[PDB]
Write a protein that binds this DNA or RNA. Structure first.
Length: 1044
DNA sequence: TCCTCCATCCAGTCTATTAGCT
DNA sequence: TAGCTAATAGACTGGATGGAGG
């Protein structure tokens, strides 16, 4: 016979596979006949070997053994000598009789039989021993007795205790092992052929669905095929005009989105297209989504010139996935149901976006619609109203918009003729991601079929880069949809703009793209109106989105967004609030809270996260109304404390629009603050620093090393060691840069350096010194003590090099033997309540909250002790006042939003007294007489800590120091003393705990700090009484009154 | 130009508890 | 079973980085 075409393929793949490997599987439907193909494969290896070629064909049943023995000799092109092993003599027959050496179970007979075969005057081409799995051991009994190895071994019906003996050479000596079945999966799941280091990879596969089509969530292979695609390009790139055309394809892509894209990124984008194209075709069934779409066509075009060049789609391995889709999408909102799944099953896993809650999306649509109605008199469906969704994602903000229209049409207020034009001409949206674009298109196209029409209004772009520059084409039809869009007077901008303020440093791949023309817009508006000088947040993507939309909007229109709600009350957003109040007439701000970068009570008050695990930021819905008017007013509502994620959504389903919300009329103040407005009388109080007649001449803010795991630690020795590793690692990168002379820069250097966070913790400044050739010495003298957290003092390598921000610490603590007092305070915009803690040592920025200011008692000079304040009495007076409950409560807003101001109080000398005591207590926090009721049970003297805990949640009576020591009868009120938002006692639990740095793998063990095994236990106990004592003292200081 | 240094807000990820599994 | 793994609920960090002023 002549081997069928796909059999040739299998033969080819087999040979190619066994060229490097020694194990392979062969999957075919029962119909084709793998038995014949196996012979033809065996022949090819026989051709190559140039000697007697030995094959072992293992088989379960007796019927198969005879069907293969006979059927092979008939189909054999070669000279074949056959061997049967079995307890049935008749099993080696065909009519015919004794076909090959007779069947036998006698190993000595099987061994001597091969001696015969060798004794022949002439040996045939290949020797095929057909055997049962049951008696396979006789082969082992033969190969031991003097039988040769097997050049090839074949297991048929491979889904199968001697059945498992084959895999190891120890049982049967053989060079290569092929596995053939039609069903590696046994029907739960009992048996599956997944190598197990035995079955091996598969070089060929045939689906039953294929053959019928051929006329006869586990996907890691997408990597394999893509790696083949991506690599073959870069190779062929190398002056092959394809490179000239593909380098033209990237430039076209670069045009439509970013210079960010290049050979790698662009090639990756086409990979994803090749994979999903058949899925989209399969989904469509009758009418091709691919042929219609511009990007598809643009992608389905560029493939051609490469397809011409001896490059195919390597997705033959992916065909069973395609078949499942073809089955799943045959015939058939039941189609949208598939779109839900395929996304979650395939796409989520395959290549690895934020899913916007429907209750949110619907809310602004109604809100935008009712706004268009009440104000302009117009509506959502008018001819001269255009709607843009600049960050479509999956087109959720369109899908739910046309659904609103559908509800309107059923109510009869709308004509489908009024809908159709919107879908066609008046609805626009765009995405920056390939897969998000496709899915977004379909989902609108499909949800429009409710009443086949492609969506004409979708682009694939970076809306920010759109208005940047105005200057050969691929995708030329794509931007045409956008070019024609750009003349539209867009009356409404809608959606969920991106949130991004930056990164953590060594994720260099991530850094907010520079949009120079938009930054300048931000710079002249939001940044200009600010009083801050630190405006990082104003270049956050969501603030860019408001800017870009504010520009792209027309004088008569509206915006509706779900965004980061930080700008509502934020230090660096005072300018943005000044702008929005001028640039807009009516602004409804719906604060959804849900900020979980807080902690403690604040965290509980914030509550549910609107995007769940999607975002940790404060969320708020903003609808900005723009008309011609002399009227300017803010409308604000706090959704309320403590609400769950779905409690908040229950309100969004309940209230579909901003018409039904009880708004608060807000008149912004001098500081452009909408909420938590300050007291203008508070300004009469004596300034603390930076003004005339201020109490302190100089204030500092806590240190920020930017690499705590390396530079700070409980063990002084560990700091010395760890710092030296990094300094060595850093000076090596420099030595590398030394002998590769270029014009290096503070950012370009990234490509020539390590990026491994187990080696170096890069920061901006450190990169700058690597752009130059700068080395360092390790100065052991620079290792000193510092307050890292309240009542937690670690060792710190304070070094201008390797510390991103050393602040004024060299003025307040010139060396590790210096003597100074500083009053740490919560700084400028903490959400937690205001607190203060005095320190005898250098203080981190996070001693209190996220940004901590400190007020030194002394400043030093190297040319020099200098009084930074008049007297000790004045110093401790300040410390006394900052503890006043009335003071803290009366001006919570001024304490949050700016540096404190101290008034002159009626019983001042009393404030000094308690000021001193409080200081005396908080400095000696680590050794204090234990409180009365407390008891300490110690089984054995194990004073080492792993992690302190309460036996159950919120039992404040007890703390398990470890599995030996426990502390009981702790007064529950001691937890009322709070620094930041956390009790002092809980800081010890939190801080004095064994943990490792996930990034660097640097361990930090608090037991290595103190030399005294009872330090932490002593510290804990003391802090409890410090807590109790502090509260007593806070209750002693006088009634809050003015004017001494 | 580029460096020094003030200033401020961050589109989840880890651990702990409870319920299952052979 | 003893003591794991899986499902579910709870808790909440260190640092990047624009721009004034050299």
């Amino acid at each position: 016979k002549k081997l069928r075409d796909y059999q040739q393929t299998a033969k080819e793949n087999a040979l190619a596979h066994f060229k490097e490997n020694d194990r392979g599987q062969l999957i075919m439907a029962p119909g084709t006949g793998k038995t014949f193909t196996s012979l033809k494969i065996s022949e090819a290896l026989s051709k190559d070997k140039n000697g007697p070629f030995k094959v072992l064909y293992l088989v379960p049943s007796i019927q198969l053994l005879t069907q293969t023995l006979r059927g092979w000799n008939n189909d054999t092109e070669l000279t074949i000598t056959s061997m049967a092993v079995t307890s049935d003599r008749d099993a080696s027959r065909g009519k015919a009789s004794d076909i090959g050496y007779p069947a036998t179970t006698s190993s000595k007979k099987i061994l001597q039989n091969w001696h015969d075969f060798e004794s022949l005057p002439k040996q045939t081409d290949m020797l095929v021993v057909f055997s049962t799995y049951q008696s396979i051991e006789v082969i082992g009994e033969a190969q031991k007795e003097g039988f040769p190895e097997f050049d090839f071994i074949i297991s048929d019906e491979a889904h199968r205790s001697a059945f498992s003996k084959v895999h190891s050479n120890n049982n049967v000596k053989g060079l290569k092992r092929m596995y053939q079945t039609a069903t590696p999966k046994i029907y739960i799941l009992l048996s599956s052929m997944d190598d197990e280091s035995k079955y091996g990879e598969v070089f060929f596969r045939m689906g039953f669905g294929q053959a019928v089509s051929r006329d006869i969530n586990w996907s890691k292979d997408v990597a394999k095929i893509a790696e083949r695609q991506i690599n073959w390009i870069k190779n062929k790139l190398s002056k092959d005009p394809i490179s000239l055309e593909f380098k033209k394809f990237v430039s076209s892509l670069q045009h439509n989105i970013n210079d960010s894209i290049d050979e790698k990124q662009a090639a990756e984008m086409l990979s994803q297209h090749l994979i999903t194209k058949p899925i989209f075709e399969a989904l469509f069934s009758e009418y091709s989504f691919v042929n219609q779409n511009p990007v598809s066509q643009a992608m389905e075009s560029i493939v051609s010139e490469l397809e011409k060049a001896g490059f195919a789609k390597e997705q033959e391995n992916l065909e069973p996935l395609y078949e499942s889709v073809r089955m799943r999408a045959e015939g058939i909102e039941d189609k949208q149901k598939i779109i839900v799944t395929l996304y979650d099953k395939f796409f989520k896993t395959a290549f690895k976006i934020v899913f916007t809650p429907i209750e949110v999306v619907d809310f602004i649509v109604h809100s935008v619609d009712d706004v268009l109605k009440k104000h302009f008199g117009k509506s959502l469906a008018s001819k001269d109203v255009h709607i843009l969704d600049p960050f479509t994602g999956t087109g959720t903000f369109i899908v739910r918009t046309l659904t609103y229209l559908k509800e309107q049409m059923d109510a009869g207020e709308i004509s489908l003729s009024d809908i159709t034009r919107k879908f066609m001409k008046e609805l626009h949206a765009n995405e920056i991601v390939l897969l998000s674009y496709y899915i977004a298109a379909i989902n609108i196209e499909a949800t429009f079929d409710e009443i086949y029409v492609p969506f004409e209004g979708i682009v694939l772009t970076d809306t920010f880069e759109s208005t940047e520059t105005e200057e050969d084409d691929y995708f030329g039809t794509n931007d045409e949809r956008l070019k024609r869009q750009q003349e539209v007077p867009i009356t409404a901008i809608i959606g969920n703009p991106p949130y991004s303020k930056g990164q953590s440093n060594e994720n260099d791949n991530n850094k907010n793209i520079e949009y120079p023309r938009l930054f300048k817009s931000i710079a002249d508006s939001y940044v200009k109106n600010s009083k801050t000088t630190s405006v990082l947040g104003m270049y956050d993507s969501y603030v860019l989105s408001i800017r870009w939309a504010s520009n792209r909007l027309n004088d008569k229109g509206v915006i509706g967004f779900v965004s980061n709600g930080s700008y509502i009350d934020s230090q660096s957003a005072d300018g943005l609030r000044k702008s929005l109040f001028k640039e807009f007439n009516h602004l409804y701000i719906f604060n959804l809270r849900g900020d979980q970068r807080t902690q403690g009570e604040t965290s509980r008050k914030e509550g549910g996260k609107i995007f769940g695990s999607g975002s940790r930021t404060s969320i708020a819905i903003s609808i900005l109304v723009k008309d011609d008017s002399d009227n300017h007013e803010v409308h604000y509502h706090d959704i309320g404390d403590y609400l769950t994620r779905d409690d908040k959504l229950d309100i969004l389903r309940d209230k579909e629009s901003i018409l039904n919300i009880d708004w608060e009329n807000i008149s912004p103040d001098e500081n452009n603050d909408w909420i938590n407005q300050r007291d203008q009388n508070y300004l009469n109080y004596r300034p603390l620093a930076d003004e005339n007649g201020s109490i302190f001449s100089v204030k500092d803010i806590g240190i920020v090393t930017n690499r705590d795991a390396w530079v700070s630690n409980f063990s002084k020795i560990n700091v010395s060691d760890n710092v030296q590793i990094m300094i060595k690692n850093y000076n090596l990168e420099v030595d590398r840069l030394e002998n590769i002379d270029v014009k290096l820069n503070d950012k370009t250097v990234v490509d020539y350096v390590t990026n491994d966070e187990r080696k170096i913790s890069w920061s901006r400044s450190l990169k700058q010194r690597a752009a130059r050739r700068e080395k360092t010495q390790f100065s052991h003298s620079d290792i000193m003590l510092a307050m890292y957290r309240p009542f937690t003092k670690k060792y710190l390598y304070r070094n201008r090099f390797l510390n991103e921000n050393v602040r004024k610490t060299y003025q307040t603590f010139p060396d590790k033997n210096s003597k100074n007092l500083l009053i740490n305070i919560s700084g400028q915009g903490d959400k937690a309540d205001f607190a203060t803690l005095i320190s005898e040592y250098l203080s981190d920025m996070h001693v209190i909250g996220g940004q901590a200011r400190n007020l030194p008692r002394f400043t030093y000079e190297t040319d020099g002790r200098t009084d930074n304040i008049v007297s000790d009495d004045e110093f401790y007076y300040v410390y006394g006042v900052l503890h006043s409950s009335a003071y803290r409560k009366r001006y919570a807003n001024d304490l949050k939003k700016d540096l404190p101001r101290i008034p002159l109080l009626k019983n001042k000398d009393k404030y000094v007294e308690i000021g001193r005591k409080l200081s005396d207590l908080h400095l000696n926090y680590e050794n204090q007489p234990i409180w009365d009721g407390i008891e300490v049970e110690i089984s054995q003297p194990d004073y080492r800590v792993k992690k302190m805990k309460h036996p159950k949640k919120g039992v404040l009576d007890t703390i398990i120091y470890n599995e030996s020591i426990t502390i009981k009868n702790i007064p529950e009120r001691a937890y009322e003393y709070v620094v930041n938002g956390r009790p002092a006692i809980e800081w010890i639990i939190d801080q004095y705990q064994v943990k490792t740095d996930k990034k660097s793998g640097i361990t930090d063990d608090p037991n290595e700090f103190s030399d005294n095994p009872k330090y932490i236990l002593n510290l804990l106990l003391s802090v409890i009484t410090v807590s109790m004592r502090t509260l007593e003292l806070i209750e002693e200081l006088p009634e809050f009154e003015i004017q001494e």
